[PDB]
Amino acid sequence: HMLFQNVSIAGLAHIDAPHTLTSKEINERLQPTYDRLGIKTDVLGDVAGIHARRLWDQDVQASDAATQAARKALIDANIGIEKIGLLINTSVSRDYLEPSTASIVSGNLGVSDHCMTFDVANACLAFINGMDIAARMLERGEIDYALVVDGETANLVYEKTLERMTSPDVTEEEFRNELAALTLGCGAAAMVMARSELVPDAPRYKGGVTRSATEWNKLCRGNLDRMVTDTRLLLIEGIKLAQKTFVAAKQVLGWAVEELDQFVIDQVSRPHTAAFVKSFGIDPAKVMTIFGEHGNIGPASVPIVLSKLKELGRLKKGDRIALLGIGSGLNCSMAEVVW
Amino acid sequence: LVPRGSHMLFQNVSIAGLAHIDAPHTLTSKEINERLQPTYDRLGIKTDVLGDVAGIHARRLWDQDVQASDAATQAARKALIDANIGIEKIGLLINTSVSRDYLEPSTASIVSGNLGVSDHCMTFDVANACLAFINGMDIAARMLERGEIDYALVVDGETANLVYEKTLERMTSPDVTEEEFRNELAALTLGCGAAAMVMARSELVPDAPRYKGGVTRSATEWNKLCRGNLDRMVTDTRLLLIEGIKLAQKTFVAAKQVLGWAVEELDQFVIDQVSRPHTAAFVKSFGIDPAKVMTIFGEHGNIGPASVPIVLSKLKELGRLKKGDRIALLGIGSGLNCSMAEVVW
């Protein structure tokens, strides 16, 4: 019924992580163990379509990556940190349980005594939830500008996950559920959202809709050291939920597929992406992809893709952009930006 | 006379149900002290820092196999009964606990699935030290005000079992430095427990309490004062106190301008449940009647962000609260962040 009319996107930025680890290099150190279980296939590069991913320097924490991203977004919006009234950290990666990663980022930045901080956690949907929570405060006049940040680190998942599978003992089927950890990638993004009367020419966030199917809360379960995931069923119920969520998006957003100029989606693998496009009859040309060379950056994936699109001059004034994702839960969220 | 703003305060947001869960197993400060006595002796500690100094005589613990999500869910069920509604009415569920099942999925997902929420139910977590429940209250308040939903659940289950056994193991080490002992000591004032609140648009529950919200100030340059993972918390209790009070004080100046507050015009203060010195310093700093500040750290310790709602729920359970009571919710979380909000009962 009632969309956001005065929430804009004032600045946007990403950080690509500096070290590359190729699925080839990974596959070499995994060959012994592939040859034990008699698996012929290259599940990373052939099936998933993931050929490289980036990793941070030694002991770069999430809050560091979020800080670098947040600094660039601030420069991109051409405002100083004294203007930020809210800072939401959305990452899966978290420096500690207590306190929030947001507070660490905000301290690194020197936010004012008026800036509210906290973390949102919700798998690959968290950035969109963060964006929506910020938009609610902006519209109410609680704040004029917000930072939504997200830094992801998988350095430790790789050290530990590899060693576990390349031991002498090794398991059998855990391998297939564990390999999903070797699709993960490091990266960061940040976005400065703002009240529109401040930034009249800037893109606008209208909000959107969420639907869920939390009955499947078992299927993807990540610690710091480990990610266990059934990808096959997550794919199907994911798409079933996405469909349902698109019906909701018709009703509140006034959406159809032919009308939308970009689909910015969570980045998992070639099969998640292809199934999605096929099910919804989407022009593949409107669907930018980064898992090929960066792997899965969880909730940073969406704003990384939007920022990349922006920087390549793909986004014309007036474009209608679908932000969407299918996160563990299962949850699904879909929202609109009008460039 | 002169038309005023709302001061950004929440309109037509109500509390339709409230519930807490006490964890089953009692752990006394005597038990703890008996176990730590060889270390106390080695370090020359001749006072009961838990019982006499910190004011905590006991705390509660779950079984070791019990999860945040399980406690969050028990509480959620009791709050639904309290609100006399089914789970089909819930359009938003935020888990606000520090304790978490996994890094993903959200602990709210796991609670939501156990309860059987509809496919219209929005779920995510909010983490912000002991201030998160209030943050979740605000996030849900904004949706209910706008009329995007009818009912919200804010849920919070804490478990400290693991930090308890590992901290006790490290603090009884023959090699443990005084520095490390003191750093880790606050973890032995933590406690298990859980809480849940159903909130609603006032139109649906015309006699329920009103949640007005309030003000927030921060001091993010102190983010390293208290830091915790699954099995360990390190705490500069001295600087938490001093910088916590300064921040409280600053927020209270803002509470006067937006809430029209004054300590003498509030009937209850629901605070973070930390310790007897933290509590005394806060009461003395603002000139508050101690009787208007209910305390449970004595027997349950510090239940992080569950403490506020647990105290609220217990205040209701005892019949302290009457229609019209002006109820200050004030939280100083690790960060530092301080929110001060008002519930009118």
XYZ file of C-alpha atoms in Angstrom:
684
model
C 0.000 0.000 0.000
C 2.333 2.801 1.410
C 5.958 3.033 0.014
C 8.882 5.208 1.243
C 8.815 8.565 -0.685
C 11.758 10.461 0.971
C 14.530 7.835 1.535
C 17.506 8.129 -0.817
C 20.848 6.391 -1.396
C 23.403 9.136 -0.911
C 26.585 7.096 -1.296
C 27.691 3.567 -2.032
C 30.975 1.656 -1.967
C 32.669 -1.798 -1.906
C 36.090 -3.283 -1.086
C 37.470 -6.229 -3.039
C 39.664 -8.385 -0.852
C 43.355 -8.414 -2.035
C 44.508 -12.059 -2.055
C 43.178 -14.535 -4.683
C 42.881 -18.259 -4.015
C 41.873 -20.137 -7.181
C 39.615 -23.218 -7.098
C 42.458 -24.858 -9.078
C 44.889 -24.205 -6.223
C 42.213 -25.502 -3.813
C 41.577 -28.581 -5.975
C 45.324 -29.502 -5.938
C 45.478 -29.603 -2.156
C 42.147 -31.577 -2.256
C 43.166 -34.179 -4.963
C 44.268 -37.012 -2.580
C 40.856 -36.761 -0.898
C 38.837 -36.607 -4.214
C 40.715 -39.773 -5.304
C 39.797 -41.578 -2.061
C 36.049 -41.096 -2.469
C 36.326 -41.689 -6.256
C 34.689 -38.363 -7.121
C 35.621 -37.532 -10.720
C 33.962 -34.069 -10.820
C 35.267 -30.562 -10.036
C 32.296 -29.344 -7.941
C 33.767 -25.872 -7.419
C 34.701 -24.728 -10.946
C 32.523 -26.991 -13.121
C 29.317 -27.318 -11.025
C 29.256 -24.202 -8.803
C 30.976 -22.067 -11.433
C 33.293 -20.537 -8.850
C 36.837 -20.135 -10.127
C 38.404 -17.849 -7.546
C 37.663 -16.069 -4.346
C 39.334 -13.270 -2.416
C 40.819 -13.427 1.075
C 41.982 -10.623 3.405
C 45.493 -10.026 4.796
C 46.285 -11.962 7.986
C 43.947 -10.999 10.877
C 41.875 -8.336 9.171
C 38.615 -8.520 11.134
C 35.105 -7.853 9.836
C 35.043 -4.456 11.565
C 38.200 -3.453 9.673
C 36.681 -4.349 6.280
C 33.418 -2.624 7.195
C 35.416 0.472 8.270
C 37.334 0.684 4.913
C 34.024 0.277 3.051
C 32.284 2.845 5.258
C 35.077 5.377 4.710
C 34.645 5.069 0.913
C 30.886 5.338 1.069
C 31.239 8.515 3.160
C 33.571 9.971 0.465
C 31.118 8.779 -2.218
C 28.223 10.626 -0.475
C 30.505 13.594 0.106
C 29.474 13.943 3.744
C 31.523 13.766 6.904
C 31.007 11.322 9.803
C 29.474 14.039 12.070
C 26.375 13.658 9.901
C 25.782 9.945 10.583
C 22.881 9.407 12.974
C 22.773 5.619 12.671
C 25.214 2.844 11.833
C 23.952 -0.721 11.260
C 26.379 -3.620 10.800
C 24.775 -6.428 8.761
C 27.612 -9.009 8.359
C 27.552 -12.726 9.116
C 31.174 -12.339 10.256
C 31.324 -10.736 13.691
C 34.338 -9.628 15.766
C 32.652 -10.757 19.006
C 29.269 -11.734 20.490
C 29.405 -8.623 22.670
C 29.672 -5.807 21.778
C 28.235 -5.151 18.342
C 30.602 -5.015 15.415
C 28.755 -1.741 14.629
C 30.129 -0.069 17.773
C 33.681 -1.078 16.817
C 33.212 0.313 13.279
C 31.665 3.522 14.676
C 34.530 3.991 17.154
C 37.060 3.506 14.333
C 35.169 6.208 12.422
C 34.665 8.608 15.347
C 30.862 8.913 15.172
C 29.147 11.469 17.388
C 27.488 10.868 20.720
C 24.076 11.022 18.855
C 24.809 8.118 16.489
C 22.755 4.980 17.287
C 24.478 1.672 16.632
C 23.652 -2.022 16.517
C 24.082 -5.212 14.425
C 21.417 -6.981 12.373
C 21.909 -10.729 11.692
C 19.825 -12.613 9.065
C 22.095 -14.600 6.649
C 22.391 -13.062 3.123
C 19.329 -10.832 3.644
C 20.823 -8.727 6.431
C 21.908 -5.749 4.290
C 18.380 -5.341 2.906
C 16.919 -5.624 6.433
C 19.505 -3.033 7.529
C 18.553 -0.805 4.592
C 14.860 -1.087 5.543
C 15.387 -0.444 9.248
C 17.425 2.671 8.346
C 14.759 3.849 5.899
C 12.150 3.673 8.713
C 14.190 5.980 10.917
C 14.918 8.375 8.048
C 11.245 8.726 7.119
C 10.382 9.382 10.820
C 13.001 12.123 11.044
C 15.037 10.290 13.676
C 18.147 10.788 11.525
C 19.200 12.563 8.332
C 21.926 10.099 7.313
C 22.663 6.418 8.139
C 25.543 4.030 7.461
C 24.718 0.429 6.680
C 27.955 -1.593 6.615
C 29.006 -5.187 6.076
C 32.477 -6.784 6.053
C 32.891 -10.538 5.478
C 35.838 -12.732 6.341
C 36.332 -16.385 5.481
C 40.127 -16.631 6.006
C 39.527 -18.866 9.038
C 36.818 -20.971 7.397
C 39.398 -21.835 4.665
C 42.340 -22.633 7.005
C 40.219 -24.919 9.158
C 37.819 -26.388 6.606
C 40.679 -27.490 4.361
C 42.680 -29.166 7.152
C 39.544 -31.044 8.293
C 38.895 -32.566 4.844
C 42.676 -33.169 4.037
C 43.462 -35.106 7.224
C 44.294 -38.849 7.060
C 40.913 -39.921 8.668
C 38.280 -37.884 6.712
C 34.541 -38.582 6.433
C 32.302 -39.324 3.410
C 29.120 -37.240 2.927
C 30.251 -34.338 5.171
C 32.633 -33.518 2.302
C 29.664 -32.495 0.040
C 28.017 -30.411 2.818
C 31.488 -28.917 3.734
C 32.598 -27.974 0.174
C 29.987 -25.212 0.362
C 32.364 -23.455 2.803
C 34.941 -23.362 -0.014
C 32.480 -21.294 -2.092
C 32.651 -18.428 0.422
C 34.531 -15.181 -0.223
C 35.854 -12.114 1.538
C 34.538 -8.650 0.766
C 32.881 -5.560 2.133
C 30.372 -2.878 1.284
C 28.810 0.157 2.787
C 25.924 2.460 1.841
C 25.066 5.961 3.120
C 21.259 6.357 3.154
C 19.668 9.803 3.590
C 16.510 11.920 3.680
C 15.712 13.047 0.107
C 15.281 16.731 0.708
C 19.036 16.649 1.491
C 20.051 14.761 -1.661
C 17.364 15.579 -4.354
C 19.089 13.929 -7.436
C 20.071 10.687 -5.652
C 18.535 7.155 -6.048
C 15.445 6.331 -3.942
C 14.678 3.206 -1.850
C 10.931 2.453 -1.903
C 11.055 -0.548 0.435
C 9.491 -3.842 -0.431
C 8.235 -7.126 1.018
C 9.432 -10.189 2.967
C 8.081 -13.720 3.113
C 9.474 -16.687 5.037
C 9.445 -20.439 5.397
C 11.212 -20.894 8.707
C 10.285 -24.637 8.799
C 13.563 -25.155 6.892
C 15.787 -23.498 9.550
C 18.034 -26.635 9.616
C 19.396 -26.457 6.034
C 22.317 -23.923 6.297
C 24.223 -23.709 9.605
C 27.521 -21.760 9.869
C 29.890 -21.440 12.835
C 33.125 -19.331 12.505
C 35.236 -22.445 11.665
C 32.612 -24.447 9.685
C 29.680 -24.234 7.307
C 27.367 -27.240 6.977
C 24.817 -26.883 4.132
C 22.337 -28.881 2.069
C 22.368 -26.846 -1.182
C 19.972 -29.045 -3.233
C 16.831 -28.560 -1.138
C 17.716 -24.955 -0.169
C 17.641 -24.271 -3.941
C 14.152 -25.608 -4.583
C 12.354 -24.265 -1.497
C 14.283 -21.060 -1.992
C 12.786 -20.638 -5.455
C 9.317 -21.757 -4.218
C 9.551 -19.006 -1.536
C 10.916 -16.479 -4.027
C 7.845 -17.085 -6.235
C 5.518 -16.452 -3.330
C 7.513 -13.327 -2.456
C 7.191 -12.047 -6.052
C 3.367 -12.343 -5.814
C 3.586 -10.164 -2.709
C 5.888 -7.759 -4.614
C 3.259 -7.416 -7.381
C 0.679 -6.250 -4.853
C 2.710 -3.679 -2.861
C 5.333 -2.575 -5.445
C 3.423 -2.704 -8.784
C 6.073 -5.008 -10.263
C 6.458 -7.159 -13.359
C 9.612 -8.786 -14.796
C 9.504 -6.877 -18.106
C 9.428 -3.544 -16.279
C 12.564 -4.050 -14.158
C 15.923 -2.843 -15.471
C 18.135 -4.678 -12.946
C 17.886 -7.696 -10.654
C 20.502 -7.485 -7.948
C 20.588 -10.871 -6.256
C 22.463 -12.716 -3.570
C 25.422 -14.523 -5.241
C 25.830 -18.262 -4.405
C 26.590 -20.362 -7.503
C 25.808 -20.867 -11.186
C 23.020 -23.376 -10.304
C 21.269 -21.005 -7.767
C 21.554 -18.205 -10.331
C 20.443 -20.201 -13.359
C 17.493 -21.853 -11.615
C 16.356 -18.369 -10.449
C 16.501 -16.742 -13.900
C 14.787 -19.776 -15.560
C 11.955 -19.995 -12.981
C 11.160 -16.258 -13.285
C 11.845 -15.851 -17.014
C 14.425 -13.132 -16.421
C 16.643 -11.671 -19.159
C 20.064 -12.925 -17.970
C 21.532 -9.610 -19.195
C 19.794 -7.781 -16.265
C 21.524 -9.980 -13.648
C 25.131 -9.090 -12.795
C 27.281 -11.929 -11.434
C 30.407 -11.950 -9.232
C 30.622 -15.484 -7.678
C 32.737 -16.560 -10.666
C 35.672 -14.559 -9.292
C 34.670 -13.721 -5.704
C 32.559 -16.638 -4.440
C 29.768 -16.150 -1.928
C 30.109 -12.927 0.114
C 26.846 -13.510 1.959
C 24.890 -10.308 2.709
C 27.577 -8.028 1.259
C 26.878 -9.626 -2.189
C 23.863 -7.425 -2.978
C 25.413 -3.998 -2.234
C 28.735 -5.142 -3.781
C 26.825 -5.858 -7.025
C 24.921 -2.559 -6.870
C 28.160 -0.657 -6.280
C 29.887 -2.469 -9.162
C 26.959 -1.682 -11.446
C 27.133 1.960 -10.353
C 30.861 2.219 -10.954
C 30.566 0.762 -14.472
C 27.946 3.334 -15.475
C 25.216 0.752 -15.947
C 22.572 2.585 -13.946
C 20.654 5.251 -15.887
C 18.529 7.848 -14.048
C 14.992 6.347 -13.871
C 16.075 2.685 -13.817
C 13.955 0.335 -11.669
C 16.223 -1.985 -9.644
C 15.165 -5.135 -7.811
C 17.175 -5.824 -4.692
C 16.524 -9.398 -3.726
C 17.771 -12.446 -1.870
C 16.902 -15.881 -0.525
C 18.531 -16.282 2.875
C 18.764 -19.096 5.386
C 15.697 -19.325 7.529
C 14.360 -19.743 4.935
C 13.595 -16.033 4.390
C 13.088 -14.031 1.169
C 13.106 -10.241 0.717
C 12.583 -8.128 -2.399
C 12.782 -4.337 -2.652
C 12.963 -1.516 -5.213
C 15.455 1.274 -5.892
C 14.662 3.865 -8.517
C 17.990 5.229 -9.737
C -1.974 26.060 24.390
C 1.126 25.988 22.129
C 1.136 23.024 19.688
C 4.122 20.711 20.221
C 5.787 17.880 18.331
C 5.634 14.267 19.402
C 9.457 14.537 19.850
C 9.786 11.499 17.558
C 7.990 9.380 20.245
C 6.024 6.301 19.270
C 2.286 6.652 18.663
C -0.221 3.901 19.355
C 2.333 1.222 20.152
C 1.349 -1.016 23.029
C 2.670 -3.994 25.029
C 0.062 -6.776 24.652
C 2.000 -9.514 26.493
C 5.044 -10.113 28.591
C 6.706 -13.208 30.015
C 9.945 -14.455 31.526
C 11.514 -17.848 32.217
C 13.816 -18.538 35.159
C 16.524 -21.129 34.498
C 16.193 -24.255 36.689
C 19.605 -24.883 38.344
C 20.931 -22.646 41.168
C 24.697 -21.939 41.398
C 25.581 -20.174 44.670
C 28.381 -17.680 45.134
C 29.430 -19.982 48.034
C 29.940 -22.932 45.658
C 31.903 -20.666 43.335
C 34.059 -19.267 46.140
C 34.892 -22.766 47.497
C 36.147 -23.701 44.075
C 38.116 -20.428 43.671
C 39.465 -20.354 47.244
C 42.904 -21.844 46.427
C 43.268 -19.120 43.781
C 41.886 -16.359 46.085
C 44.498 -17.494 48.636
C 47.316 -17.574 46.099
C 46.307 -14.028 44.954
C 45.707 -12.664 48.487
C 41.998 -12.023 47.918
C 40.458 -11.810 51.404
C 37.030 -10.506 50.465
C 34.018 -12.106 48.817
C 34.043 -10.061 45.620
C 30.922 -11.885 44.354
C 28.733 -11.990 47.471
C 29.733 -8.889 49.451
C 31.250 -6.554 46.820
C 29.254 -7.418 43.661
C 26.031 -8.212 45.564
C 25.332 -11.538 43.799
C 24.608 -14.531 46.024
C 23.326 -16.895 43.311
C 22.591 -17.119 39.613
C 20.647 -19.687 37.515
C 21.814 -22.046 34.791
C 20.179 -24.240 32.167
C 21.265 -27.734 31.303
C 24.384 -27.679 29.088
C 22.372 -28.985 26.071
C 19.885 -26.061 26.210
C 20.201 -23.358 23.512
C 19.335 -19.668 23.295
C 16.658 -20.538 20.719
C 15.076 -23.091 23.126
C 14.804 -20.566 25.990
C 13.690 -17.813 23.588
C 10.919 -20.167 22.429
C 9.737 -21.165 25.941
C 9.408 -17.453 26.799
C 7.680 -16.653 23.492
C 5.004 -19.279 24.201
C 4.321 -17.822 27.651
C 4.056 -14.306 26.198
C 1.576 -15.500 23.580
C -0.615 -16.987 26.320
C -0.240 -13.720 28.214
C -1.336 -11.780 25.055
C -4.083 -14.363 24.504
C -3.192 -14.690 20.784
C -2.043 -17.442 18.430
C 1.263 -17.386 16.525
C -0.645 -16.821 13.233
C -1.109 -13.144 14.267
C 2.590 -12.415 14.509
C 3.996 -10.513 11.551
C 7.452 -9.670 13.008
C 9.829 -11.618 15.230
C 13.141 -10.173 16.426
C 15.596 -12.235 18.556
C 17.706 -9.778 20.593
C 19.996 -12.136 22.603
C 23.787 -12.117 22.950
C 23.811 -15.905 23.185
C 23.396 -17.290 19.663
C 22.866 -20.785 18.204
C 24.936 -20.251 14.990
C 26.370 -17.295 13.012
C 23.730 -18.177 10.405
C 20.821 -18.784 10.304
C 19.366 -16.169 12.633
C 18.339 -17.369 16.049
C 14.952 -15.711 15.236
C 14.608 -18.190 12.350
C 14.966 -21.122 14.755
C 12.498 -19.630 17.262
C 10.113 -18.798 14.410
C 10.216 -22.346 13.010
C 9.625 -23.908 16.480
C 6.603 -21.660 16.984
C 5.293 -22.124 13.432
C 4.990 -18.449 12.298
C 3.145 -17.669 9.051
C 4.921 -17.061 5.759
C 4.053 -13.328 6.271
C 6.337 -13.306 9.375
C 9.481 -11.141 9.150
C 12.467 -12.489 11.129
C 16.016 -11.348 11.954
C 18.385 -10.874 14.893
C 19.553 -7.706 16.590
C 22.805 -7.869 18.578
C 23.815 -4.887 20.730
C 25.037 -6.113 24.137
C 22.450 -5.562 26.961
C 20.545 -2.821 25.092
C 19.275 -5.072 22.263
C 15.808 -5.822 23.631
C 15.018 -2.138 23.736
C 16.488 -1.783 20.185
C 14.109 -4.592 19.068
C 11.248 -2.922 20.888
C 12.012 0.257 18.863
C 12.350 -1.529 15.512
C 9.016 -3.241 16.089
C 7.444 -0.033 17.440
C 8.223 1.677 14.096
C 6.424 -0.930 12.060
C 3.376 -1.097 14.373
C 3.018 2.684 14.376
C 3.129 2.699 10.588
C 0.519 -0.077 10.560
C 2.568 -2.591 8.528
C 1.747 -5.293 11.120
C -0.674 -6.045 13.960
C 1.612 -7.912 16.354
C 5.327 -8.367 16.919
C 7.378 -10.790 19.080
C 10.623 -9.608 20.622
C 12.339 -12.646 22.149
C 15.510 -13.187 24.096
C 17.070 -16.291 25.612
C 20.494 -16.132 27.310
C 22.736 -19.043 28.299
C 26.070 -18.610 30.184
C 26.818 -22.285 31.036
C 29.753 -22.453 28.737
C 31.329 -19.153 29.841
C 30.834 -20.362 33.454
C 32.646 -23.715 33.143
C 35.494 -22.372 30.924
C 36.013 -19.186 32.996
C 36.004 -21.191 36.223
C 38.530 -23.565 34.630
C 40.872 -20.689 33.550
C 40.463 -18.820 36.881
C 41.495 -21.897 38.857
C 44.704 -22.250 36.793
C 47.921 -22.277 38.831
C 49.355 -19.858 36.209
C 46.461 -17.372 36.078
C 47.738 -13.753 36.409
C 45.917 -11.192 38.649
C 45.243 -9.236 35.525
C 43.516 -12.161 33.808
C 41.606 -13.088 36.984
C 40.239 -9.532 37.230
C 39.520 -9.306 33.491
C 37.473 -12.524 33.557
C 35.791 -11.999 36.945
C 32.631 -10.270 35.652
C 31.655 -13.408 33.729
C 30.951 -15.083 37.075
C 28.176 -12.472 37.674
C 26.288 -13.507 34.540
C 23.064 -15.505 34.653
C 20.761 -17.579 32.462
C 17.153 -16.747 31.787
C 14.826 -15.630 29.069
C 12.057 -13.196 28.170
C 9.579 -12.308 25.496
C 7.222 -9.446 24.727
C 4.259 -9.304 22.308
C 3.661 -5.728 21.141
C 0.672 -4.490 19.191
C -1.098 -1.485 17.692
C -3.025 0.165 20.590
C -6.310 -0.103 18.680
C -6.283 -3.916 19.241
C -5.417 -3.794 22.996
C -6.940 -0.512 24.315
C -6.016 -1.262 27.993
C -2.505 -2.619 27.426
C 0.522 -0.428 28.356
C 1.857 2.155 25.931
C 5.465 2.069 24.686
C 6.529 5.638 23.958
C 10.177 4.959 23.146
C 12.715 7.650 24.051
C 16.297 8.764 23.419
C 19.655 7.294 22.573
C 23.141 8.502 23.104
C 26.455 6.739 22.439
C 30.150 6.595 23.328
C 31.669 4.297 20.702
C 35.235 5.214 21.661
C 34.720 2.775 24.634
C 33.820 -0.297 22.536
C 36.761 -2.319 23.918
C 35.664 -2.070 27.554
C 33.747 -5.372 27.499
C 34.299 -8.150 24.982
C 32.855 -11.677 24.795
C 32.823 -14.883 22.714
C 31.151 -18.265 23.444
C 33.504 -19.155 26.328
C 35.055 -15.900 27.595
C 34.201 -12.369 28.658
C 36.828 -9.680 29.513
C 35.498 -6.587 31.362
C 37.013 -3.277 32.534
C 34.317 -2.954 35.252
C 35.940 0.286 36.534
C 35.749 2.140 33.227
C 32.350 0.588 32.408
C 31.068 2.177 35.603
C 32.617 5.606 35.115
C 31.958 5.944 31.394
C 28.588 4.219 31.725
C 27.429 6.808 34.291
C 28.728 9.730 32.194
C 26.799 8.382 29.237
C 23.666 7.753 31.309
C 23.918 11.354 32.542
C 24.177 12.786 29.008
C 21.215 10.662 27.825
C 19.176 11.899 30.815
C 19.641 15.540 29.744
C 18.184 14.434 26.405
C 15.389 12.472 28.212
C 14.345 15.750 29.918
C 14.002 17.503 26.503
C 12.139 14.676 24.705
C 10.414 12.712 27.493
C 9.920 15.657 29.897
C 11.463 13.385 32.563
C 12.333 14.148 36.154
C 13.396 11.479 38.615
C 10.656 12.418 41.134
C 7.841 12.022 38.486
C 8.743 8.393 37.511
C 7.235 5.459 39.443
C 9.613 2.647 38.366
C 13.132 2.471 36.965
C 13.933 -0.770 35.110
C 17.748 -0.862 34.786
C 20.525 -3.179 33.602
C 21.090 -5.827 36.187
C 24.856 -5.678 36.753
C 25.858 -5.418 40.422
C 25.277 -3.656 43.745
C 28.028 -1.037 43.100
C 26.808 -0.270 39.537
C 23.231 0.051 40.850
C 24.193 2.224 43.899
C 26.268 4.582 41.719
C 23.401 5.016 39.260
C 20.785 5.661 41.960
C 23.141 8.118 43.765
C 24.163 9.818 40.538
C 20.502 10.764 39.703
C 18.957 11.048 43.181
C 16.499 8.176 42.657
C 14.539 6.423 45.414
C 16.036 2.884 45.729
C 12.542 1.412 46.336
C 11.632 2.535 42.777
C 14.487 0.296 41.397
C 13.775 -3.443 41.444
C 16.806 -5.736 41.544
C 17.287 -9.400 40.580
C 21.091 -9.720 40.160
C 21.070 -10.773 43.837
C 19.675 -14.153 42.865
C 19.825 -14.336 39.018
C 22.899 -12.270 38.185
C 23.170 -10.357 34.905
C 21.017 -11.751 32.119
C 22.337 -9.240 29.626
C 19.672 -7.841 27.293
C 16.979 -10.104 28.841
C 17.373 -8.351 32.238
C 15.150 -5.339 31.346
C 12.132 -7.339 30.175
C 12.630 -9.931 32.929
C 12.481 -7.143 35.518
C 9.449 -5.621 33.805
C 7.727 -9.090 33.790
C 8.541 -9.718 37.432
C 7.266 -6.263 38.382
C 4.004 -7.252 36.722
C 4.046 -10.683 38.384
C 4.393 -9.041 41.889
C 1.634 -6.486 41.195
C 3.980 -3.465 41.600
C 2.501 -1.804 38.464
C -0.852 0.054 38.254
C -2.572 1.692 35.233
C -0.981 5.126 34.776
C 2.471 4.233 36.163
C 5.267 5.992 34.318
C 7.947 3.354 33.808
C 11.536 4.351 32.887
C 13.477 1.674 30.881
C 17.205 2.695 30.985
C 19.969 0.618 29.461
C 23.718 1.131 29.269
C 25.086 -1.562 26.925
C 28.706 -2.411 26.037
C 29.566 -0.170 23.084
C 28.872 2.168 24.780
C 25.229 2.823 23.979
C 22.512 4.133 26.296
C 18.795 4.183 25.543
C 16.210 5.602 27.869
C 12.565 4.868 27.144
C 9.128 5.193 28.821
C 6.324 2.703 29.212
C 3.029 4.068 30.577
C 1.332 1.118 32.214
